């Protein structure tokens, strides 16, 4: 079976410029488990990115949290880039900063 990932990009806390925070990329609802997830700062790949232990939901679909410490600013743009067998091009989701 093949299921395409759902992606949310968001901060752990309400974002304020100059205040340390965590940038999250939550990927879920996918199968198989092989997946490539990168966090981006102004188009460039962030290096110090950790992730959760692989687990799955009632319907057997996988989920992972990728995350890194960051300090938001006005200028810096953030995003999550995901590649998976179900995707023809890598999927880039931008951090909206809505909360």
């Amino acid at each position: 079976i093949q299921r395409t990932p759902k992606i949310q990009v968001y901060s752990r806390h309400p974002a304020e410029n100059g205040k340390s925070n965590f940038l999250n990329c939550y990927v879920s609802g996918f199968h198989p488990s092989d997946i490539e997830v990168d966090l981006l700062k102004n188009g460039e790949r962030i290096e110090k990115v950790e992730h959760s232990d692989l687990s799955f939901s009632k319907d057997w679909s996988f989920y992972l949290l990728y995350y890194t410490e960051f300090t938001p600013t006005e200028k810096d743009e953030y995003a999550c880039r995901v590649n998976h067998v179900t995707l023809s091009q890598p999927k880039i989701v931008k951090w909206d900063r809505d909360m």
Partner: protein, 274 residues
């Protein structure tokens, strides 16, 4: 509220070289407490919550012994399924298993689980009576026959009804400070104007535990599901969860709408209004 202990196992075959990638994780409710990864350096079951680090060396030796045996079972399973489905050794395949127990508010046994999937599809599952099997296809039928002859349901029932709940009760007591604490959602509303005629109201629930929550909108006191969006509940990364719900409204009528939040940590549900 009810409580649960659940273990999740994933094995992925690596056809080019070597043995499958095996990952095991254990949860109490929505809190991960242990992990094992075949690709990690320790080759030990590792703690992922403070309260399980209370457990001494004999616990960690036992869980490491059992999880490595679980790993070998799944290695053999991948081989068996390749034979049952007449597949080559060229492709990568996945097996997943989940088992565990639910208890109620009184900490007494409520339900048990033991189920299996191959390449993301249902394979075999223990039924709620813990005495019979749901086999999804003819390959799984062969497994069912084998397990029925070897009295596997009886073995699992003994664990799920007894030892499993004893483990859960022990963990609930030892991790009382967090595991028995509810974190009520921190709520607020935001407003987004797309045009002079349309506005979006978003109702936020942040920093809550457990993950179960209901967000609903009303206009003039009656529910509304139309022109609404509800995102999947997501982890904050610090043990708590986040969710939002949105409604599209005519500009100037925001005050008609209310967001309602139901959660275990709230004695009475909350109402928010712009």
């Amino acid at each position: 509220g009810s409580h649960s202990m659940r273990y999740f196992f994933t094995s992925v075959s690596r056809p080019g070289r070597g043995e499958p990638r095996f990952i095991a994780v254990g949860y109490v409710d929505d809190t991960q407490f242990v992990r094992f990864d075949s690709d990690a350096a320790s080759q030990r079951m590792e703690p992922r919550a403070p309260w399980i680090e209370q457990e001494g060396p004999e616990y960690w030796d036992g869980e490491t012994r059992k999880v490595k045996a679980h790993s070998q079972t799944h290695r053999v399973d991948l081989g068996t399924l390749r034979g049952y489905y007449n597949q080559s050794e060229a492709g990568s395949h996945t097996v997943q298993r989940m088992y565990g127990c639910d208890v109620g508010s009184d900490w007494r046994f409520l339900r048990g689980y033991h189920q299996y999937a191959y390449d993301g599809k249902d394979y075999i599952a223990l039924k709620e009576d813990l005495r019979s099997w749901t086999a999804a296809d003819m390959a799984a039928q062969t497994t069912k026959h084998k397990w029925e002859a070897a009295h596997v349901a009886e073995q699992l029932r003994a664990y799920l009804e007894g030892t499993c709940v004893e483990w859960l009760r022990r963990y609930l007591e030892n991790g009382k400070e967090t595991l028995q604490r509810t974190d009520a959602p921190k709520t607020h509303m935001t407003h987004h104007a797309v045009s002079d005629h349309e506005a979006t109201l978003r109702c936020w629930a942040l920093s809550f535990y457990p993950a179960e929550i209901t967000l609903t909108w009303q206009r003039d006191g009656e529910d509304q599901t139309q022109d609404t969006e509800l995102v999947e509940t997501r982890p904050a990364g610090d043990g708590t969860f986040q969710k939002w719900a949105a409604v599209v409204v005519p500009s100037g009528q925001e005050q008609r709408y209310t967001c309602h939040v139901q959660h275990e940590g709230l004695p009475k549900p909350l109402t928010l209004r712009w």
